[PDB]
């Protein structure tokens, strides 16, 4: 099925920028 390659790339990292963001934000800043 096409939405098994096209959902764990599109929208995975659509949800990972609250992750992300807070991971570096613990550094020092964002």
Do not use: D, E, Q
Request: glycine share 4%; charged share 10%.
């Amino acid at each position: 099925m096409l939405i098994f390659v096209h959902i764990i790339a599109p929208v995975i990292s659509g949800c990972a920028i609250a992750f992300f963001s807070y991971w570096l934000s613990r550094r020092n800043t964002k």
